[model samples]
Target: QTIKIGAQSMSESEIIASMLGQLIEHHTDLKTTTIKNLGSNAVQQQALMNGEIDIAATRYTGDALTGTLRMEPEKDPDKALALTQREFKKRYDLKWYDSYGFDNTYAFTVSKELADQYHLETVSDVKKWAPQLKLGVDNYWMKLKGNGYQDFTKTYGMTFGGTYPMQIGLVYDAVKSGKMDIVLAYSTDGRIKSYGLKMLKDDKQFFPPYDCSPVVPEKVLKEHPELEGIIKKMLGKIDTATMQELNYEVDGNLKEPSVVAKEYLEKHRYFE
Candidate 1:
């Protein structure tokens, strides 16, 4: 008998899938398998409902609230998770678990060399470097009424040397390739590591949270109660910094998921 784990298309889903399976396979006699290509979280919800998979490996609060539920985006992180839990439980008996200690939120980043050169630890810390820094951002963000470039400049009381509006997909590459001195990107993007960049702290919490949590059907928990403990042990265990580093093992290092998973488990002593 195998404990099947389902994951969406992204790299972190597989990374988390690996983590889920590694914990089960290593700690118990249970066999496990992970399928990493359901692509969309909404589809993942269907797969879980159809009984095709035993576990949903990754669920983001924002995606669950807005995309899966097709409801409003709750900028308030707490309400987002609460809404996800209430709806998932009401509609399908699936329950959302605690976040794995990090949210893949919007963040500013610069090369490690640049970050270290001036102790650029916070968004405002860029004040001194703002005049000389080239910035890349998702085009829509520049004109967004609030929490966008114009607002950010006024909020932080500073401006950049230059700004280029590009597709969201292009900002990482633009910053990583050094075409831009800084870029706004998802905090946990593996490309951050792949490109030798570091995220500055969003001390002001400018972005809404997209905390990743595992959504499990109540049946799975009832059937394999041990899973509850396994999931519990991992709750809040991985922060964004660690997630980004591990994500790099696959997206950047091109290492096998199993290899990275096992290494992480071993290094942490299998989470004791």
Candidate 2:
């Protein structure tokens, strides 16, 4: 039997998918095919539901709950994961596997220079400085009603000097170049560190923990019983720092994801 592993276009997703594909091929008799660049998380989820893909690497619990299911965000990581597991199984007949042990949540970041200039240490501090600083965000963030920019601002009692909706990828550069004073970024994005940006503390805990894990269809699991064991070995294997480094290897160093995946598995002796 063949297993199809899918991934979104992001560097982290592609890297994790490649790692899983390699591990499955090495450990099981089943052949593995990769369907990469599946557009977005929603697209990948639909493909999994339609059986176009058997596996999705790095599906975040928060995104599953808020983005896909349109449910209220749960702040507690364990509770969020539990809710995701139950809902995913009940609604889509999918299984949420053990987490990869990382939380890639949203973080409001500013250049270190800006942080020092404004003495900003927390989201509250940002709120105080909001009137003097321009906020950079993606279009989706602006449109997302419940937990998006509007809710975030309201929760923190912030009103920025202006809001600039740029491409998600460009936000980091925009902040670094002083084009925007502050931007929302992924907690584990390597650019946060490379650009010398400070991730302001989410003092109010507004955003949900985005713990990532592999998600597979129930039908696929039933057909390939051995897969459960093979995939489970990945549980808690990757932490936030490790994930950031892997992302840097691909995004910063421009290495092929397949090579990075193979090296990571070899380092951990996954093939042995």
Candidate 3:
């Protein structure tokens, strides 16, 4: 069988796609083709639904909100609630992976220079200076509700005026140059340190948990019986810390995504 995976062409997504491509090729009697790597999560979802791709590793939250997907948290039910919204899955016949355990956090970041000058240590500090500071928020942050950028400002009682449709890389660059005092970002993004940005404490607990796992379309699973095992194996070893380290290898050390994935699988005896 041939499996096609579509991922964003950015560093992180490319790395993940490369790793998954290797995993599928090695583990199954399947050849893999990676598609054009440019498109939003919505595009990927549409492609998956249209049978353009066999599987994808994209944002789980978007799918959850749209009744298009489900996921398994590594933690138990109660603890999982803090990290996930379960109502959607329960209402729909969506199935998830066993538990990849990787939880990605949305964070508030400020430049190191600004942090030192203003003594900004928390979201409250950002709130106090928000009226005076120029804030940069991505299009996704501005549009998506709840765990997205809209809810973050609401929770912290801050206001941002300048919204740019910048890519993740540009967002970091804007913050670093002090063109924007604060921006919303992902916690595990390796570029945080590169930009010398300090994370503002998410003290208010405004955002929901974003635990990632395999979320395949229901019909795809019905056709591919072996997919369950593949998902289980992939999900069993992933967690926040593990994912951070993996991100470090690709982002910090400049290693290939396939190299990082293969090393992790071997370490966990999954490769054997």
| Number of backbone collisions per candidate | 0, 0, 0
| Ranking of models by lDDT | 2, 1, 3
Task: List ranges where model 1 is wrong by over 4 Å.
Answer: 106-171, 178-184, 193-207
lDDT of 2 at 110: 91
Cα lDDT of model 2 by residue, 89-132, tens digit: 99999999879888888788999998897788999877667788
Candidate 1 CA-lDDT value: 0.81
Greater-lDDT candidate between 1 and 2: 2
- Report how far off residue 230 is in candidate 1 (Å): 1.8
RMSD of each: 5.4, 1.8, 4.2
lDDT of 3 by residue, 79-112 (tens): 5543333543454323545446665666889988
**What is the C-alpha local distance difference test score of each model?**
0.81, 0.85, 0.64
Estimate the TM-score of every prediction: 0.71, 0.93, 0.77
What clash pairs does model 1 have?
A: none
By lDDT, the best candidate is 2
User: lDDT of candidate 2?
Assistant: 0.85
lDDT per residue for candidate 1 within 33-82, as digits (tens), equals 98778856668889899988888888888656655676656778888788
